[PDB]
């Protein structure tokens, strides 16, 4: 078990740059690109809004497979 | 007629419709859960009024509405849609008025 456990720790440490999971990146880009969409304001503003909102499917499906309500956690996670 | 009967007026022609939809998007940020996406859908449902005004008059719904979402988000709440010359503008100066 120590070899099967540390093996995950090995790859995590081997890369000196780590990213938080669980839907943090998809929500952070959704809120940031929402305000960045106003920096263009012609056409792509609708495309950027749809591109950023499309990232919410990743944290949504993680909650569905976990039996928890996705409409709650994903909405609460974005508000935080 | 309604100008004399009602002395309380709000800027129309897309002005008030955007301000109501503007603030409710910010109010939905404080509310978490399904009610957040429902209020966001309500504010998105308020966008059909200024949309159809541009589509029925021949104006471009993609450019004018997006440009309307810009200047209105810049701190001026009175920007409407000019029905004479296509552009975004203040209907309080253009005198498009409806009672509250």
Curated annotation (Swiss-Prot), chain A:
It is found in: Cytoplasm. The gene is TCP1. This is T-complex protein 1 subunit alpha. Heterooligomeric complex of about 850 to 900 kDa that forms two stacked rings, 12 to 16 nm in diameter. Molecular chaperone; assists the folding of proteins upon ATP hydrolysis. Known to play a role, in vitro, in the folding of actin and tubulin. In yeast may play a role in mitotic spindle formation. It comes from Saccharomyces cerevisiae (strain ATCC 204508 / S288c) (Baker's yeast). Belongs to the TCP-1 chaperonin family. The chain holds residues 401 to 480 of 559 of the full protein.
From Swiss-Prot, chain B:
Belongs to the TCP-1 chaperonin family. Heterooligomeric complex of about 850 to 900 kDa that forms two stacked rings, 12 to 16 nm in diameter. It is found in: Cytoplasm. It comes from Saccharomyces cerevisiae (strain ATCC 204508 / S288c) (Baker's yeast). Molecular chaperone; assists the folding of proteins upon ATP hydrolysis. Known to play a role, in vitro, in the folding of actin and tubulin. In yeast may play a role in mitotic spindle formation. This is T-complex protein 1 subunit eta. The chain holds residues 401 to 500 of 550 of the full protein.
